Design a protein around this nucleic acid. Structure first.
Ligand SMILES: [K+]
Ligand SMILES: [K+]
Ligand SMILES: [Mn+2]
Ligand SMILES: [Mn+2]
Length: 134
RNA sequence: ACAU
DNA sequence: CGATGT
């Protein structure tokens, strides 16, 4: 219905898919960038969308914030709900780093708790998510 | 189809 | 136009 402005928005950016992956999180209300992940040489859009949500969860928990997270990724929202990133990306030497991070993110989800609502950003009604990469 |  | 996903 209405945008919850008191929230954190996250998004992936890539150069190719699979390709170089990065992500960031921004204050939905002000656009202030609150965190940015160093580019990862090879990953998928959905792995990056997933890591962005999990980093958001850790970021808000450390600061004792009950704000929700917005993501535009139907896939990544489901993966976080399941605490399982069902990526098809080949596990080999050159994907080793992204899979390490995905594996460590699942591990964090499986050893911590949170109440953070993870909400679908309704791009069709509201434009691109505020964390988008132009 | 939907979401990227 | 291709790829990642449910
Ligand atoms: K973009
Ligand atoms: K498709
Ligand atoms: Mn996105
Ligand atoms: Mn985007």
């Amino acid at each position: 219905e209405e945008i919850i402005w008191e929230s954190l928005s996250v998004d992936v950016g890539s150069q190719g898919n699979p390709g170089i992956v990065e992500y960031k999180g921004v204050d939905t209300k002000t656009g202030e960038v609150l965190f940015e992940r160093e580019p990862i040489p090879i990953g998928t859009n959905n792995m990056g969308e997933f890591l962005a949500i999990v980093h958001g969860l850790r970021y808000l928990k450390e600061r004792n914030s009950r704000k929700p997270i917005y993501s535009d990724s139907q896939t990544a929202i489901k993966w976080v709900k399941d605490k399982k990133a069902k990526s098809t990306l080949v596990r080999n030497e050159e994907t080793a780093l992204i899979w390490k991070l995905v594996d460590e993110a699942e591990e964090w989800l499986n050893t911590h708790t949170y109440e953070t609502p993870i909400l679908k950003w309704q791009t069709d009604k509201w434009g691109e998510i505020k964390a988008d990469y132009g």
